Design an enzyme around this catalytic site. Sequence first.
Site, PDB file in Angstrom:
ATOM      1  N   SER A 106       0.829  -1.236   0.000  1.00 47.75           N
ATOM      2  CA  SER A 106       0.000   0.000   0.000  1.00 47.75           C
ATOM      3  C   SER A 106       0.871   1.298   0.000  1.00 47.75           C
ATOM      4  O   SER A 106       1.760   1.471  -0.870  1.00 47.75           O
ATOM      5  CB  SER A 106      -0.964  -0.046   1.184  1.00 47.75           C
TER       6      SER A 106
ATOM      7  N   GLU B  36      -9.228  -6.056  -3.207  1.00 48.24           N
ATOM      8  CA  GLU B  36      -8.666  -4.813  -2.659  1.00 48.24           C
ATOM      9  C   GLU B  36      -9.673  -3.785  -2.028  1.00 48.24           C
ATOM     10  O   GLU B  36      -9.402  -3.168  -0.961  1.00 48.24           O
ATOM     11  CB  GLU B  36      -7.838  -4.130  -3.747  1.00 48.24           C
TER      12      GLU B  36
ATOM     13  N   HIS C 128      -7.678  -6.330   1.101  1.00 48.34           N
ATOM     14  CA  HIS C 128      -6.440  -5.563   1.146  1.00 48.34           C
ATOM     15  C   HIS C 128      -5.721  -5.816   2.461  1.00 48.34           C
ATOM     16  O   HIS C 128      -6.326  -5.662   3.531  1.00 48.34           O
ATOM     17  CB  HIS C 128      -6.827  -4.081   1.031  1.00 48.34           C
TER      18      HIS C 128
END
EC number: 3.1.1.8
Length: 527
Positions: free
Chosen positions: A196, A323, A436
Amino acid sequence: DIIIATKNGKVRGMQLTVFGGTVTAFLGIPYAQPPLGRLRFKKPQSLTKWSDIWNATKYANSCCQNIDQSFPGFHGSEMWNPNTDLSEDCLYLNVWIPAPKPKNATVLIWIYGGGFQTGTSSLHVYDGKFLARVERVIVVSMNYRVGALGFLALPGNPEAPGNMGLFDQQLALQWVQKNIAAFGGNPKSVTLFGESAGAASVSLHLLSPGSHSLFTRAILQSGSFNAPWAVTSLYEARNRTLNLAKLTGCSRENETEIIKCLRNKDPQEILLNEAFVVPYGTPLSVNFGPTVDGDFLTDMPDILLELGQFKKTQILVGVNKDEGTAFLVYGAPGFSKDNNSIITRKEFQEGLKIFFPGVSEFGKESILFHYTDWVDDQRPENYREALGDVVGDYNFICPALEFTKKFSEWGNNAFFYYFEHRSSKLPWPEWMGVMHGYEIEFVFGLPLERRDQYTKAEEILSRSIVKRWANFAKYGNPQETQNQSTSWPVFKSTEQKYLTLNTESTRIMTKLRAQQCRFWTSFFPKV
Ligand SMILES: *[C@@H]1O[C@H](CO[C@H]2O[C@@H](C)[C@@H](O)[C@@H](O)[C@@H]2O)[C@@H](O[C@@H]2O[C@H](CO)[C@@H](O)[C@H](O)[C@H]2NC(C)=O)[C@H](O)[C@H]1NC(C)=O
Ligand SMILES: *[C@@H]1O[C@H](CO[C@H]2O[C@@H](C)[C@@H](O)[C@@H](O)[C@@H]2O)[C@@H](O[C@@H]2O[C@H](CO)[C@@H](O)[C@H](O)[C@H]2NC(C)=O)[C@H](O)[C@H]1NC(C)=O
Ligand SMILES: *[C@@H]1O[C@H](CO[C@H]2O[C@@H](C)[C@@H](O)[C@@H](O)[C@@H]2O)[C@@H](O)[C@H](O)[C@H]1NC(C)=O
Ligand SMILES: *[C@@H]1O[C@H](CO)[C@@H](O)[C@H](O)[C@H]1NC(C)=O
Ligand SMILES: *[C@@H]1O[C@H](CO)[C@@H](O)[C@H](O)[C@H]1NC(C)=O
Ligand SMILES: *[C@@H]1O[C@H](CO)[C@@H](O)[C@H](O)[C@H]1NC(C)=O
Ligand SMILES: [Cl-]
Ligand SMILES: [Cl-]
Ligand code: NA
């Protein structure tokens, strides 16, 4: 008893038993002068040096940051919150080495995600002791400044130049270059990895001239700098800096006076106003982030990427199947972690207003047109599924695929994965899928600990990932050569082959999200 002599002094580490063997941990070695007082908002200053033995036997303070209080008592969110005291005095790193001391081991440096606003190296899912034990690499991780205190920018002014948290990272990389041979490491074999915001950071180190000679290769998990949340324009940056001034009563006329003022506010006053330096935000807001400062970053990074002005080396890039689902329970109407979140066409529309603050009405209708041509059953979860895909494709997946195409068009080998395994221990509901952030524990080898209630299929998956990541770092090629595994082909423009990671068999596929990314990548940036 293990003492290593470093250029700034001696440090003592501690021995850990891992899977019937020993790893040595040095937790919390300082790598810069504490950035306090008149150092607040400035680039990190190099380390003075101690005598006697620095005891690196516990994790250091985390940097100041707001904390996620949406689900008190819930492991799913709380596992990401900091687990050491917060403090401006947070510029430390950790090293884990195999025992016995290796001879010239490959180095893996982790950079954590957290939106550039949060995060810390001492989370349990970032514990490097399994990787050191199992693959005999050295793992290093560092704390860097986040939020205004790490990214506040008044462009061109060394009292607040911007990108300070990226310079914290850089100076840690320098510390590895000067010091890691003492712990048994090879400074000429260093791989950065991150997830990320941490992936986005890894990708800007590929563009930064000052980072060029501080590493060999790079791994990007769910993020890259071309993501729409990753870089703040110079205009927003200044508007946000004065907006914070205003809100803390620090408005001045001479800009060095604002900074001087802000250096007397105390951390909680700054943290408390971060959320409102912006008229409307979303669950993906990056209020204080990387900017084009003319120092770490010399030009808009989309231009550097298009025109081939980055470090030539191999990359490993990936994303997770779902995600975008994590962000929907932080403000989309009709969504809850505590039910199956069936939402209606009209909740979907409202959801886009939440995620695309504006964004013309035509902008938003065009997302709807593209994501709601059902085929077809009807299918009550149609709209719930479409909103997560929107959020995932726009923010993570299409940007990572586009970074990968452009990077590879300049002649370098690149490898792309699509992670589709849902942890058997996931505390979030089933509808949220392969979320995610939940590949990380597999990369770090937590499922290798049997005691820990992961399935057998998960131990094997993790063991194979760890080997591929290690082979990438050591040899530039993420193969698992021994257990007649599927070969991972390089990703090129044209065919765009990628590898799926799951507990059954892994496959070679082509052109992930082809139709969707044509939308985000060619058309949407126009609106
Ligand atoms: C640049 O900032 C202005 C300032 O507006 C803000 O005042 C700050 C101190 C902060 O508290 C913040 O919450 C507040 O919004 C932004 O102007 C605002 O924009 C909205 C939407 O257009 C208007 O309805 C408001 O009237 C307006 N406020 C003021 C006081 O003018 C502005 O949008 C922003 N520009 C950007 C995004 O760079
Ligand atoms: C799934 O739950 C959401 C979330 O809101 C609710 O969470 C539940 C677990 C419960 O504690 C409830 O009391 C709480 O408010 C529901 O969305 C809500 O729907 C209600 C309908 O009464 C609205 O009044 C709320 O405005 C709305 N809140 C938000 C923020 O969306 C949702 O309806 C529920 N859906 C199901 C059961 O499919
Ligand atoms: C340790 O190995 C050093 C070189 O190995 C690296 O060289 C880089 C250019 C790149 O090829 C890396 O992938 C290689 O692994 C060597 O020069 C050192 O002298 C060695 N140090 C020791 C063993 O003392
Ligand atoms: C460093 O750690 C060891 C712990 O056994 C101790 O003997 C030594 O005095 C320590 N120094 C300190 C506490 O600063
Ligand atoms: C603003 O104040 C700073 C800090 O003392 C000073 O050095 C600078 O010259 C001033 N800038 C101008 C030109 O007004
Ligand atoms: C290869 O397979 C064996 C089982 O036959 C397994 O125990 C071993 O750890 C595997 N190695 C890797 C790197 O996956
Ligand atoms: Cl309608
Ligand atoms: Cl396989
Ligand atoms: Na269109």
